[PDB]
Design an enzyme around this catalytic site. Structure first.
Site, mmCIF file in Angstrom:
data_model
loop_
_atom_site.group_PDB
_atom_site.id
_atom_site.type_symbol
_atom_site.label_atom_id
_atom_site.label_comp_id
_atom_site.label_asym_id
_atom_site.label_seq_id
_atom_site.Cartn_x
_atom_site.Cartn_y
_atom_site.Cartn_z
ATOM 1 N N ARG A 147 34.034 6.056 76.741
ATOM 2 C CA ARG A 147 33.760 7.952 76.296
ATOM 3 C C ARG A 147 32.075 7.908 77.040
ATOM 4 N NH1 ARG A 147 36.146 6.179 72.227
ATOM 5 N NH2 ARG A 147 37.476 7.622 71.181
ATOM 6 N N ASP B 84 34.969 12.800 70.036
ATOM 7 C CA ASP B 84 33.631 12.604 69.406
ATOM 8 C C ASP B 84 34.214 12.130 67.705
ATOM 9 O OD1 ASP B 84 32.296 14.212 71.923
ATOM 10 O OD2 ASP B 84 32.878 12.046 72.244
ATOM 11 N N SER C 99 33.718 11.126 62.253
ATOM 12 C CA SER C 99 32.347 11.875 63.691
ATOM 13 C C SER C 99 31.635 10.068 63.644
ATOM 14 C CB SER C 99 31.347 12.017 62.790
ATOM 15 O OG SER C 99 30.523 12.775 63.261
ATOM 16 N N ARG C 100 31.596 10.144 64.906
ATOM 17 C CA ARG C 100 31.390 9.267 65.903
ATOM 18 C C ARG C 100 29.876 8.680 65.864
ATOM 19 N NH1 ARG C 100 35.653 7.376 67.035
ATOM 20 N NH2 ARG C 100 35.743 6.149 68.653
ATOM 21 N N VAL C 101 29.065 9.789 66.322
ATOM 22 C CA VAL C 101 28.219 10.233 66.992
ATOM 23 C C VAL C 101 27.142 10.506 65.128
ATOM 24 C CG1 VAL C 101 26.468 11.717 67.825
ATOM 25 C CG2 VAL C 101 28.295 11.749 68.668
#
Ligand SMILES: Nc1ncnc2c1ncn2[C@@H]1O[C@H](COP(=O)(O)OP(=O)(O)OP(=O)(O)O)[C@@H](O)[C@H]1O
Ligand SMILES: Nc1ncnc2c1ncn2[C@@H]1O[C@H](COP(=O)(O)OP(=O)(O)OP(=O)(O)O)[C@@H](O)[C@H]1O
Ligand SMILES: [Mg+2]
Ligand SMILES: [Mg+2]
Lengths: 470, 240, 56, 475, 474, 119
Positions: free
Chosen positions: A191, E314, E339-341
């Site tokens: 990504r 994401d 949630s990746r972030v």
């Protein structure tokens, strides 16, 4: 030399006709560089890889960037060879794409760089190595309970939080520092938000000087995603063959390599097989993994992440990848909450090298007892979730005491965590961890506070760290 | 049928009803002619243009500033599979939907309507009132709780469970049978003549079932009836 | 009564351990049948699609 | 007899010209690379490429060898590592063969075959005692990945040193490192002097993997018809099925269940049925086969596993969860059977262990009920003790075969009730200590069984077994 | 030359012969005035997709080359207007009066041009702000089933951004036109339309325009992003786009796979989604952020289009039907939302306040799922099960009513700190609105500080205010 | 041919009655698979005992099985077969254990096979 023209276009696919009959071979690469003649046209700088000889002097091609703007009657030119990327010391520290172009704003690699093919015939049976060797990573849990093997494929099952990026950078630092070997990172399908964060962390951790990185983005046509491992691979072959050093290759997710192959088989037109995958799943998967082996000069070892398609290890994609792997390390979020770093589960990680003729008998016995000790502790965990500790038998209380120390001693103070925490960090040789765990397992050190074992190196460090408390 | 209904809506200006019977047979016909027209196949042997044709027909069936078409349609679920393309695409174009289930029809609860899967945009507090909405959502909690609890009853047995779990099963049986009704077109099918229940009455009665006032009566009296008054008498004949 | 009640609770405990172990084994056996079926259907729909596409 | 290629995609190719071609011929490209002709449409021959296709262009040249699919055979191949085509791989120069055989031979007919009557002693206690293999039986080793499948075959080839057998190993789809390693292991035990290893590893084009199991038996049948006995091992027939599925799809042959086309049953049988025990008129020779199958999820019930369970004369089923409880090698006795077995045992072993299955079959099932079981009757409790020693008596170690006279003596003790005295953990030491006691002291019992293939004096053996038990000590 | 002639006309796809210099992705003009996009180039025939009514195109009619790549009109004049995927006004109200154009086939901002997400997007939904953070530049998937709350989740987000310095776009794909009219009408009343764009692709239109509709919507937002203002985009069903490409391909005879979705589906969905980025300071610090929607049949998270959108984003917010029919609203499943972030898009106060909540909810999930029935038990388990229940009520919220962030951190400080133990589970809903009254009249000092410092005040003062209210409550 | 006319009334009441006991056992398969036979009550207990007897008494020793198992074979005439099922169904042999009902010919053989065990 011979120049062809484009006679068909549909999405990623293009066909070229070569009128003299002098034609390109099956994995060669072709350039379109064109300057717009009238203001209706759009200038184009594309490249294409050959795939089939369809007949009547025409060739089917997959495209490496966007095909919009193409006008049949365009001119295309042949390089006489596969895609070739630069190899040598020129690549250390800089990020490249599939075509070998530098993406970093750090200049351009010169013409003189030796460029070698992506596609090459695989290594032969008169060239490999007879005897297994074990690679010392300097990480206690990995070296003790799931030994990595040189020439091996290792599998990382994990997500976010549990912290893949710390484990990858600490491995690159330990191999570069102690075993004197470089690494490569090839993030098939990374990504974009992740590529930027990774470049900043690789730079700010200081690890960048010893690694070379290839990024193939999600927004590229499928053929680019598929060949991206094959360029990260051809860079590592140079170091083992000439620099003779041992090398480490990281692949961001192997599932996207197989899925890009499926999408290219659909475009080209091959009939779908089991669960919609390409007809040739193994001959594509096999032709990448077999390059990763220990030849006499030196070895390539690989850490590959995998995502099971629907929690079905029986699906065609996991079954072909799990054929090749030699060790498996699982990262579980639960440990990463209590305080254990690296967060690797001792009871779900296994290797085909934890055997007394590979490791030696003293190492095998010490590892078998540690797993027995922990599995019994886990039975008492559900009893301790209902009830108090002193409600157990004294035999079960001894299992809890020792196990809780082992879990903490399994943890370790990493160097690449130095920026975040003042603590310096340590590297442990395999003989020192085997000796130390033998001392804990006789109980020589049981008269010590529990937290003495947290984030420490050799067992003698525990003695001194104890004194620190008092 | 639609061109006639459109002329009455637009030029005459009177309000109108449209009844279309089995609109799936429109979608099914296209398939038969698709292959002989030269079209390649898509999904479960369906035309390459399913959503288009449904859109062209369905987007004409509207109530404009000039006048209103109230529209009632029957759809056949192609193979008892609500996940099929023709029903799924159709579900996007409706304001209210009732789904019919064969499992209820096997138990003899007519009309056999799913009280959870049937939803309409008008179940909002403002468009029906606070008293109506309170009772409606509370019934939907009771019937969803009965669904999960039936698995536990089927394997382990009903006596194994708590007083609150027992009282849910008690009320849910009565609510589910009291959703059944005696129709005039069920005169031919069931002997008994039929009933019309005004909305105010329906709210009173369902509130009594939820508050437990009528729980003494035996459950068999709630099948194929109209008003709660009737349920009291039907029980008297049984002898309670 | 003290022997009877102590031995009861114990009996319930033993049955519940074995009952849970039988249930978890049945979950893995059933799970594989579901996966085998999901793989099977996917292949069927694809082959019917491609058979008509090959005809036309 | 010269043509030109016109389409060259994904292995499958087609060529215009070659008007007279034969089905199954060999064709040579200008590259020096080889190919097989499989189809003849009115203007174009369909060719499968058996080598690197990256130099084959439209309009290139393909020429006729003049011979039917042929594999080189001779005595010079023994001790060499070779390709499926007769080409040396180990280095060490040419193979220097003398003649050839077709890879599309007919099998031995009925009336040209005889029933079996000589043993194939594996030196593995569980296989020899419970699941016999006669010379010429066809038996399938089926288990999930990493269950020891390769472990069983190599233990057999080493033990087939002493006996005058030729053994062939055919590695289909395996990783190249595992194969090089096997050759060094065979050289260390001295095995390579009487064997041939045939290699088709996973980086190769699918056509040489497909012809590979067939090639293995074309080398072995040469020795069979000359009279000497032979064994063949196929390291993954389920990877041979995969390669056909690819070769058929690109060819565009229509689909079947999973995706395997209908010729999967015809493929596997053409290979297995070639294995026969020839009669005395044919010189009494024998081929013999050990195919391997890997099954998903450790379940016996699936398409390719059930096809090969149909062609063979039995099966050996290995369990992953036995192996992880540590039992090595691990063999479920209930789902493993031999259909030709019962004639393939020596006379002493028929008398000794026709009953071991009763102790094992029953014991494995019984321990399931008893763990959950509130109570056990004295009869059940006794059955359990005898069963307990058998599992420990059937546990072995890697690369250590036990001679057959020593097998019948340890099984006699256990099946005679004397072994019950020794404790579980001590049984293993006793078995090592007994084999040593027989070498040093009990030579008369060992001479009789070998010479007369039959049990020695029970009274001497009872006397002898009591005499050993006095000398033995415990814990 | 630049003139060709139509030979096949059907179902939107009209093949043509001639037009030798056409590009893939050009615009071509028919005589009728309808436009079309050339998407296939065979050796003898151009394959043209019609972007308008086709009942008037006959065989042998002439089609002429525009000379330009597919372009969407952009400018400040589009704000507050209802528009087509092509730049054509629909609300009435006359022309859009745009100034310039952009390609709908833009490149995504590359690595070295992006930064780490560093700032929050306050949605005003208690569960979405506390538990599943979205920060400017993230790609967030709302995946669920028909009739669960999805459109509601997006609309509340637009309203709660009124005060913030934000631009928002809504891209309504495949929806019945009365529903788009209801949504536009709902926002107007809330005064939202003054800073928003609605892009509409109703179910009667040719499938090609549903396919361009998500690309036209990002092509409008990227203009404002590269000029420096932050922008938000919502796509009302990506599954309805997928289908339109499938129809617009299978008619042009491209090869098929899986559920007959052509082999470009990952290349199509990813390019649209990756355009979102938080450009760096050299680029002027702009940001897109994106909210794709996917509808899943019987919750098959394993289907072809769902496996694909769960990957490119994401994070995900998976919504469940049984939670809705159980009083949990919005029906957000905590276990499957990721949630990746996560950890950077909250204000400093919420970070410190919310850490305990994610752990508390996980313990209730495991423990209650066995022990609701067993009451007469270890006091630790009984206490743990109380927090779970109260937490589920404090996360419950009403339709069309967003909550400012300072009030969210205060109620969660209470739930985490456990002042709420004394209060029964039932009236937490009414109480949560009321503690809000006491805070406004009396506690102006605590609130002034949170907005200004993004930080939490002194504990003694907070404990004093909350303990005092606990005296007042009955 | 399982018709009252062709096989006769006696062979008929007996055949259907056997099928009725066995079909109930399949319905009780998926309950006894989890809990065991504590959940079962009354008729459920008696039906499972008789179903176990019936299912093992349908198994036989064959002359062609002699090449696999050392036992001799048995031929059971029809009048014996029909007669045997009745006594199992009535409950006349309730006392004898289930392992004595396997690989036997005519019914008597079960009594001597039980007597060998003494159970
Ligand atoms: N009897 C044994 N005693 C001890 N160790 C053994 C024994 N048999 C096999 N092993 C070891 O256990 C492991 C079994 O894996 P092995 O490669 O032999 O299984 P396999 O089924 O033949 O693998 P494959 O799936 O590739 O065919 C190896 O490490 C092997 O060396
Ligand atoms: N938080 C909420 N509180 C109360 N009612 C709600 C809430 N969320 C949704 N609803 C109601 O439930 C339904 C949700 O409508 P919504 O448009 O979200 O459904 P959907 O099927 O996701 O829509 P679409 O088909 O456009 O995706 C409506 O009837 C709405 O009034
Ligand atoms: Mg093997
Ligand atoms: Mg909606």
């Amino acid at each position: 030399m011979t120049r062809g023209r484009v006679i068909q276009v549909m999405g990623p696919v293009v066909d070229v006709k070569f009128e003299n009959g002098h034609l390109p071979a099956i994995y060669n690469a072709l350039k379109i560089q064109h300057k717009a003649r009238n203001e209706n046209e759009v200038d184009i700088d594309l490249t294409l890889e050959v795939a089939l000889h369809l007949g009547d002097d025409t060739v089917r091609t997959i495209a490496m960037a966007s095909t919009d703007g193409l006008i049949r009657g365009m001119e295309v030119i042949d390089t006489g060879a596969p895609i070739s990327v630069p190899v040598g010391e020129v690549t250390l520290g800089r990020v490249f794409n599939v075509l070998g172009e530098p993406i970093d704003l750090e200049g351009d690699i010169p013409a003189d760089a030796r460029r070698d093919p992506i596609h090459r015939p695989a290594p032969k049976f008169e060239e490999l190595a007879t005897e297994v060797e074990i690679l010392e990573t300097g990480i206690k849990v990995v070296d003790l309970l799931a030994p990595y093997i040189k020439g091996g494929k290792i599998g990382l099952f994990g997500g976010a939080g549990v912290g893949k990026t710390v484990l990858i950078q600490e491995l690159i630092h330990n191999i570069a520092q102690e075993h004197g070997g470089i690494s490569v990172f090839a993030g098939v399908g990374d990504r974009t938000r992740e590529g930027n964060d990774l470049y900043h962390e690789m730079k700010d951790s200081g690890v960048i000087s010893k690694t070379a990185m290839v990024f193939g983005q999600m927004n590229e046509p499928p053929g680019a995603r598929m060949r991206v491992a094959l360029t990260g691979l051809t860079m590592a072959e140079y170091f083992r063959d000439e620099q003779g050093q041992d090398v480490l290759l990281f692949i961001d997710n192997i599932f996207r390599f197989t899925q890009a192959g499926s999408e290219v088989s659909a475009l080209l037109g091959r009939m779908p097989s089991a669960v919609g995958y390409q007809p040739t799943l193994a001959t594509e998967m096999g032709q990448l993994q077999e390059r990763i082996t220990s030849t006499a000069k030196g070895s390539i070892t690989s850490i590959q992440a995998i995502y099971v398609p629907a929690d079905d290890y029986t699906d065609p994609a996991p079954a072909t990848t799990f054929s090749h792997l030699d060790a498996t390390t699982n990262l579980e979020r639960k440990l990463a909450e209590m305080g254990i770093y690296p967060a690797v589960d001792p009871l779900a990680s296994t290797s085909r090298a934890l055997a007394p003729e590979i490791v030696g008998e003293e190492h095998y016995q010490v590892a078998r007892k540690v797993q027995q000790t922990l599995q019994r502790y886990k039975e008492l965990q559900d009893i301790i979730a209902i009830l108090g500790m002193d409600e157990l038998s004294d035999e079960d209380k001894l299992v809890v005491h020792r196990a809780r120390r082992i879990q903490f001693f399994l943890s370790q103070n990493f160097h690449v965590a130095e920026q975040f925490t003042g603590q310096p960090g340590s590297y442990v040789p395999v003989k020192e961890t085997v000796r130390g765990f033998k001392e804990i397992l006789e109980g020589k050190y049981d008269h010590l506070p529990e937290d003495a074992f947290r984030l420490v190196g050799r067992i003698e460090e525990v003695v001194e760290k104890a004194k620190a408390m008092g | 049928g639609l061109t006639m209904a459109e002329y009455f809506r637009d030029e005459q200006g009177q309000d109108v009803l449209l009844f279309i019977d089995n609109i799936f047979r429109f979608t099914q016909a296209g398939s038969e002619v698709s292959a002989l027209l030269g079209r390649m196949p898509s999904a479960v042997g369906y035309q390459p243009t399913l959503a288009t044709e449904m859109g062209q027909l369905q987007e004409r069936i509207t109530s404009t500033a000039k006048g209103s078409i109230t529209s009632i349609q029957a759809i056949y679920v192609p193979a008892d599979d609500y996940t099929d393309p023709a029903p799924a695409t159709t579900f996007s174009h409706l304001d209210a939907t009732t789904n019919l289930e064969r499992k209820l029809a096997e138990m003899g609860i007519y009309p056999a309507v799913d009280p959870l899967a049937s939803t309409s945009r008008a179940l909002a507090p403002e468009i029906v009132g606070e008293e109506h909405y309170q009772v409606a959502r509370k019934v939907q909690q009771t019937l969803q709780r009965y669904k999960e609890l039936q698995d536990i009853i089927a394997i382990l047995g009903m006596d194994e469970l708590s007083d609150e779990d027992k009282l849910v099963v008690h009320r849910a049986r009565r609510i589910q049978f009291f959703l059944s009704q005696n129709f005039h077109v069920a005169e031919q099918f069931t002997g008994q003549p039929g009933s019309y229940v005004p909305v105010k009455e329906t709210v009173r009665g369902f509130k009594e079932i939820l508050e437990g006032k009528y729980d003494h009566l035996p459950e068999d009296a709630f099948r194929l009836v109209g008003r709660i008054e009737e349920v009291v008498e039907k029980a008297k004949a049984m002898g309670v | 009564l003290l022997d009877a009640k102590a031995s009861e609770h114990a009996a319930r405990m033993t049955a519940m351990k074995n009952a849970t172990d039988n249930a978890n084994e049945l979950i893995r056996t059933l799970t594989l049948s579901y996966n085998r079926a999901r793989q099977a259907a996917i292949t069927q729909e694809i082959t019917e699609i491609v058979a008509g596409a090959n005809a036309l | 007899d010269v043509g030109t290629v016109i389409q060259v995609g994904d292995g499958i190719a087609r060529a215009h010209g070659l008007d007279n071609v034969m089905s199954g011929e060999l064709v040579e490209f200008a590259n020096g690379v080889m190919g097989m002709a499989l189809n003849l449409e009115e203007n174009n021959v369909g060719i499968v490429i058996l080598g690197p296709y990256t130099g084959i262009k439209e309009g290139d040249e393909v020429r006729r060898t003049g011979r039917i699919m042929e594999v080189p055979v001779g005595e010079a191949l023994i001790g060499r590592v070779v390709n499926p085509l007769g080409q040396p791989v180990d280095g060490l120069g040419p193979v220097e063969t003398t003649e050839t055989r077709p890879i599309e031979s007919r099998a031995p007919g009925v009336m040209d075959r005889r029933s079996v009557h000589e043993p194939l002693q594996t030196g593995i206690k569980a296989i020899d005692a419970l699941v016999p293999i006669g010379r010429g039986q066809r038996e399938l080793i089926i288990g999930d990945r990493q269950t020891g499948k390769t472990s069983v075959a190599i233990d057999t080839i080493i033990n087939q040193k002493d006996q005058n057998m030729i053994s062939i190993y055919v590695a289909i789809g395996q990783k190249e490192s595992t194969v090089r390693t096997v050759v060094e292991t065979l050289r260390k035990h001295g095995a390579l002097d009487y064997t041939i290893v045939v290699t088709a590893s996973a980086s190769q084009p699918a056509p040489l993997l497909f012809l590979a199991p067939y090639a293995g038996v074309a080398m072995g049948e040469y020795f069979m018809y000359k009279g000497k006995h032979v064994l063949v091992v196929y390291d993954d027939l389920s990877k041979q099925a995969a390669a056909y599925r690819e070769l058929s799809l690109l060819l565009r042959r229509p689909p079947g269940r999973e995706a395997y086309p209908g010729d999967i049953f015809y493929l596997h049988s053409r290979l297995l049925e070639r294995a026969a025990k020839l009669s005395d008129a044919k010189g009494g020779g024998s081929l013999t086969a050990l195919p391997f199958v890997e099954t998903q999820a450790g379940d016996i019930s699936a398409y390719i596993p059930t096809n090969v369970i149909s062609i063979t004369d039995g099966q050996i089923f290995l369990q992953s969860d036995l192996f992880f409880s540590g039992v090595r090698p691990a063999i479920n006795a209930g789902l493993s059977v031999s259909r030709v077995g019962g004639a393939a045992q020596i006379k002493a072993m028929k008398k000794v262990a026709g009953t071991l299955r009763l102790d094992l079959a029953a014991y494995r099932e019984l321990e399931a009920f008893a763990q959950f079981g509130s109570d056990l009757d004295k009869a059940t409790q006794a059955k359990l003790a005898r069963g307990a020693r058998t599992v420990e008596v059937l546990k072995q170690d890697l690369h250590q075969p036990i001679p057959v006279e020593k097998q019948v003596l340890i099984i006699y003790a256990l099946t005679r009730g004397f072994l019950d005295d020794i404790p579980v953990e001590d049984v293993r030491r006793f078995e090592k200590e007994f084999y040593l006691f027989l070498d040093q002291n009990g030579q008369h019992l060992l001479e009789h069984i070998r010479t007369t293939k039959d049990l020695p004096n029970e009274d001497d053996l009872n006397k002898a077994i009591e005499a050993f038990k006095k000398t033995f000590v415990v814990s």
